[PDB]
Design a protein around this ligand. Structure first.
Ligand SMILES: Cc1cc2nc3c(=O)[nH]c(=O)nc-3n(C[C@H](O)[C@H](O)[C@H](O)COP(=O)(O)OP(=O)(O)OC[C@H]3O[C@@H](n4cnc5c(N)ncnc54)[C@H](O)[C@@H]3O)c2cc1C
Ligand SMILES: Cc1cc2nc3c(=O)[nH]c(=O)nc-3n(C[C@H](O)[C@H](O)[C@H](O)COP(=O)(O)OP(=O)(O)OC[C@H]3O[C@@H](n4cnc5c(N)ncnc54)[C@H](O)[C@@H]3O)c2cc1C
Ligand SMILES: Cc1cc(=O)n(C)c2c3c(ccc12)OCO3
Ligand SMILES: Cc1cc(=O)n(C)c2c3c(ccc12)OCO3
Ligand SMILES: [Zn+2]
Ligand SMILES: [Zn+2]
Lengths: 230, 230
């Protein structure tokens, strides 16, 4: 309040722990007066593939299809497919984008990778060049809220998975920061599946709690040294 | 010896630089007398979404759908969807898997991320426990062949985009090594669209030339140190 929040949510099951974290993010920010929108990608059957159907009407060059060039020209000429233009308007208006997802292979599920390949297009997200700290979406906050199968200890620098910031890098720096976002600190709920149940309700409530002061937070100093450095 | 290769390929335009790197891989390994298979994900309209459509049997927990639990059970039961089992059969038989793709947001295009999410399921590619050096696909080689928009210097330490290896981590270590593969050194073909004809032509021949000696190669030490250093 008086802010707009988009939650991009990527889980198949409403009773999941991811559902719960999305449902408290809605409740708590609703409570505070914020304007809230949720893109439930599985329930929308969101199309993850970057293809020629993403451009309506006719293309610059049907001899050799280049996806980046074509989507860029289609953004400028307002001829993107409507699923994409709908998401862009939500992002455009949002002051905070929250991504709520289970970690798949040290990254986002494919349905959410496709939202990012398709919606964050050239002309809207960034414009080769006019990027990083000057990316087209500067002023907006972005926040990853990730659940993991693996425990907190596995995600340290000398444990099996290496350090959490290592996988964060393509998402946080290569995507969010590249587009102009200022990135709040990931929220990582480590290993909900191996409960309890008690410790679940508490991970959830720390999420609720943190969202009480979300607007006070400072953005991470988005650098190579934050993700890897000493 | 006789060898089987799978090329998992993710570009939309047969005439692209990616198309050409894939075709010369086919020509060169074909010429050596290797068995070669290409999964052309876009021409297959490959399904990247991990949904409950991926299980044809009675669900293990039909009240609360968890994708990892259900695909693991579906795999032991032989109740996965046929597109997934067709890919697993190609991977199972392959001695080498080459991924051929344009970098999208510091990672794979979503259609390829969906191949990772849905094909590399628990019970086939890995087990809890039975991961990293004990992953189920032990024995097999894997190689990333990645094209970029950025140079060829932007991809160093400082370094607009940071070191190239930073973004390889989730793919190489978190996915491939985790499934037991030994990973060979990425083929990164920087900035083809900027590049002039002599540089394109020669990037294409440098790949051809490298494949001549591919079974002579040793895998990378797939570590935090290789990826990040210092
Ligand atoms: C393809 C694939 C790739 C993967 N790659 C990785 C990886 O790279 N790294 C990694 O660490 N893990 C990985 N995983 C594992 C995955 O990240 C975890 O399975 C997932 O994050 C668990 O979250 P969930 O929301 O789906 O759990 P859920 O099982 O849906 O939730 C956990 C439990 O909490 C319960 N619950 C729901 N809401 C509440 C609430 N309100 N209060 C109390 N309890 C509640 C649920 O009913 C359930 O019992 C991968 C999994 C898959 C399927
Ligand atoms: C959603 C999205 C996200 C992206 N994210 C990133 C990112 O994170 N980092 C980054 O660096 N880049 C990124 N890019 C840029 C992208 O990776 C490049 O556009 C891509 O790697 C170029 O490969 P291509 O095959 O499409 O090149 P093409 O445009 O197809 O190749 C350029 C030229 O090569 C020619 N060619 C093909 N074969 C040959 C041949 N054998 N001999 C001579 N010429 C040939 C073609 O005719 C063409 O004219 C992103 C792009 C998109 C669309
Ligand atoms: C890469 C990875 C690391 C990890 O710590 N865990 C628990 C994983 C997992 C998967 C797939 C990948 C991983 O499915 C269920 O649990
Ligand atoms: C993250 C990134 C780094 C980069 O160096 N380049 C060229 C990019 C690009 C994209 C999207 C992201 C990137 O579309 C066209 O070129
Ligand atoms: Zn950054
Ligand atoms: Zn590794």
């Amino acid at each position: 309040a008086g802010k707009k929040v988009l939650i991009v949510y990527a889980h198949q099951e409403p009773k999941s722990f991811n559902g719960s974290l999305k449902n408290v993010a809605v409740d708590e920010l609703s409570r505070q007066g914020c304007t809230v929108t949720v893109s439930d990608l599985y329930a929308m059957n969101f199309e993850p593939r970057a293809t020629d159907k993403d451009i309506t009407g006719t293309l610059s060059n049907p001899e050799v299809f280049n996806y980046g060039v074509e989507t860029h020209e289609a953004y400028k000429q307002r001829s993107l497919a409507s699923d994409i233009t709908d998401e862009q308007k939500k992002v455009r208006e949002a002051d905070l984008v929250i991504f709520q997802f289970p970690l798949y292979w040290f990254s986002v599920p494919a349905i959410l990778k496709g939202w990012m390949d398709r919606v964050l297009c050239q002309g809207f997200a960034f414009d080769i060049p006019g990027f990083y700290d000057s990316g087209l979406l500067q002023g907006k906050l972005a926040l990853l809220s990730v659940t993991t199968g693996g425990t907190a200890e596995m995600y340290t620098k000398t444990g099996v998975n290496g350090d959490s910031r290592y996988f964060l890098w393509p998402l946080q720096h290569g995507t969010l920061h590249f587009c102009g976002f200022k990135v709040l600190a990931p929220q990582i709920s480590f290993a909900p599946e191996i409960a309890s149940e008690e410790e679940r309700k508490g991970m959830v409530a720390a999420w609720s709690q943190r969202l009480q002061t979300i607007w006070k937070e400072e953005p991470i100093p988005c650098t190579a040294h934050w993700h890897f450095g000493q």
